[PDB]
Design an enzyme around this catalytic site. Structure first.
Site, PDB file in Angstrom:
ATOM      1  N   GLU A  32      -2.563  -0.168   7.943  1.00 47.33           N
ATOM      2  CA  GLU A  32      -1.736  -1.209   7.345  1.00 47.33           C
ATOM      3  C   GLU A  32      -0.486  -0.633   6.691  1.00 47.33           C
ATOM      4  OE1 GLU A  32      -3.686  -3.600   4.431  1.00 47.33           O
ATOM      5  OE2 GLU A  32      -1.872  -4.747   3.953  1.00 47.33           O
ATOM      6  N   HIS A  86       2.225  -7.481   4.126  1.00 45.87           N
ATOM      7  CA  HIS A  86       0.871  -6.967   4.267  1.00 45.87           C
ATOM      8  C   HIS A  86       0.338  -7.296   5.650  1.00 45.87           C
ATOM      9  CE1 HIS A  86      -0.441  -5.690   0.164  1.00 45.87           C
ATOM     10  NE2 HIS A  86       0.691  -6.312  -0.122  1.00 45.87           N
ATOM     11  N   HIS A 103       0.816  -1.213   0.000  1.00 49.92           N
ATOM     12  CA  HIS A 103       0.000   0.000   0.000  1.00 49.92           C
ATOM     13  C   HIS A 103       0.849   1.262   0.000  1.00 49.92           C
ATOM     14  CE1 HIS A 103      -3.333  -2.785   0.448  1.00 49.92           C
ATOM     15  NE2 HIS A 103      -2.617  -3.351   1.404  1.00 49.92           N
ATOM     16  N   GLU A 128       0.906 -12.115   4.706  1.00 49.20           N
ATOM     17  CA  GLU A 128      -0.082 -11.427   5.535  1.00 49.20           C
ATOM     18  C   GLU A 128       0.274 -11.749   6.985  1.00 49.20           C
ATOM     19  OE1 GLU A 128      -2.360  -9.306   4.906  1.00 49.20           O
ATOM     20  OE2 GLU A 128      -2.970  -9.472   2.800  1.00 49.20           O
TER      21      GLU A 128
HETATM   22 ZN   LIG Z   1      -2.582  -5.336   2.120  1.00 48.14          ZN
END
Ligand SMILES: [Zn+2]
Length: 218
Positions: A50, A105, A15, A180
């Site tokens: 995030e 992430h 991001h 993740e």
């Molecule tokens: Zn993400």
């Protein structure tokens, strides 16, 4: 592991630190469709984003890799401005012809679910995706789990998650996984993610996964 100094790792903190209207533009997915250039990313219930978690965790990963003599490059250079589209992040990785690519992430799932999952391109689109990236996913999963971080209770199997919908994975031509780290909506994972020591904990485990995979390739 020995014989890893000089190898090349591309690091992608997921991001952007800031978003504008250009993140909605459509970019190829690698399987014949398109999706948004970028997404803002998720956040904890009380608003820790995030994009800041992935940024700081990736900086810690980079520092540890540099100490091992491993070459690195990153997909973005700050946490307060626009960053590249998802197809561009794959193109940046591919231009470097790296030995390993890791995108970092954090997830949004049911608040009672916690833990990590490691995504990899499936069905594979090339030889890197069919072989080395699957091995990388397993080494990374093993090192996260060995570090005491539980595999996710709410998605995937044992912390592994074959996926066809991630443009950065679909488009990679070199070994590539997406970690993740946890669920930002879960009280344990969010508390870890908000703390410098928790982000170091995730980084240390990711580094063990990277170093173990790089060593296996030698
Ligand atoms: Zn993400």
């Amino acid at each position: 592991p020995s014989n890893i100094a000089g190898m090349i790792v591309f690091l992608d903190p997921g991001h952007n630190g800031a978003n504008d209207a250009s993140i909605g533009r459509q970019v190829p997915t690698g399987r014949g469709g398109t999706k948004n250039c970028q997404e803002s990313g998720t956040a904890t219930d009380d608003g820790y984003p995030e994009h800041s978690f992935t940024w700081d965790t990736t900086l810690r990963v980079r520092a540890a890799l540099t100490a091992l003599g491993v070459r690195t490059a990153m997909s973005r250079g700050n946490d307060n401005a626009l960053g590249p589209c998802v197809d561009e992040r794959a193109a940046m990785a591919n231009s470097l012809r790296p030995h390993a690519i890791v995108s970092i992430h954090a997830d949004g799932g049911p608040p009672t679910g916690r833990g990590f999952h490691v995504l990899y391109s499936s069905p594979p689109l090339n030889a890197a995706q069919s072989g080395p990236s699957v091995q990388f996913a397993k080494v990374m999963r093993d090192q996260l789990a060995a570090s005491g971080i539980p595999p996710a209770t709410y998605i995937g199997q044992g912390g592994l998650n074959p996926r066809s919908d991630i443009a950065g994975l679909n488009l990679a031509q070199f070994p590539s996984v997406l970690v993740e780290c946890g669920n930002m909506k879960n009280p344990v994972d969010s508390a870890l993610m908000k703390s410098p020591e928790g982000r170091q904990k995730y980084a240390d485990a990711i580094v063990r996964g990277i170093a173990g995979f790089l060593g296996s390739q030698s």
